[PDB]
Design a protein around this ligand. Structure first.
Ligand SMILES: CCCCCCCCCCCCCCCC(=O)O[C@H](COC(=O)CCCCCCC[C@@H](C)CCCCCCCCC)COP(=O)(O)O[C@H]1[C@H](O)[C@H](O)[C@H](O)[C@@H](O)[C@@H]1O
Lengths: 54, 55
């Protein structure tokens, strides 16, 4: 016998969308954090960059 | 003799007998049996599983 599910001539398909993974709720109990600092404000952390343009 | 043989054989073989369908492997849809799940089964919804080449 042939397996019940085979063959699909119609519905050509579509290009898979760009994957957008989600942060792990199971593996991480919370949200992973980067730079550590006192940050006596709403929160900036130990990482702050900037690009000075012309 | 029949009861003792039954008990002894069952106690001998029950150590070996294991349920193939005990949900053990974690998955986004809760723990599932081993046969259903492989390394490609997302442990949590939306997990990224790269097709890593094995150098
Ligand atoms: C005449 C005897 C009549 C009784 C037949 C008994 C066999 C039917 C089982 C009935 C109870 C089943 C539900 C309760 C039990 C349950 O849930 O367990 C299940 C698995 O059933 C077991 O337990 C062990 C099975 C016992 C061995 C049966 C041997 C076959 C019999 C039919 C042949 C001898 C009888 C004499 C006739 C021949 C005469 C010779 C001429 C699944 O395992 P699991 O959930 O993974 O946990 C694992 C733990 O069990 C596991 O011991 C442990 O090893 C862990 O590995 C663990 O993983």
């Amino acid at each position: 016998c042939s397996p019940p599910g085979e063959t699909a001539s119609s519905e050509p398909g579509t290009t898979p969308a760009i994957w957008t993974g989600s942060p792990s709720p199971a593996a991480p109990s919370g949200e992973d954090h980067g730079g550590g600092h006192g940050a006596g404000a709403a929160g900036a952390g130990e990482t702050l960059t900037a690009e000075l343009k012309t | 003799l029949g009861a003792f043989g039954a008990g002894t054989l069952v106690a001998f073989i029950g150590g070996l007998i294991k349920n193939p369908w005990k949900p053990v492997v974690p998955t986004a849809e809760g723990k599932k049996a081993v046969l259903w799940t492989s390394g490609w089964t997302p442990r949590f919804k939306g997990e990224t599983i790269y097709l890593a080449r094995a150098t």
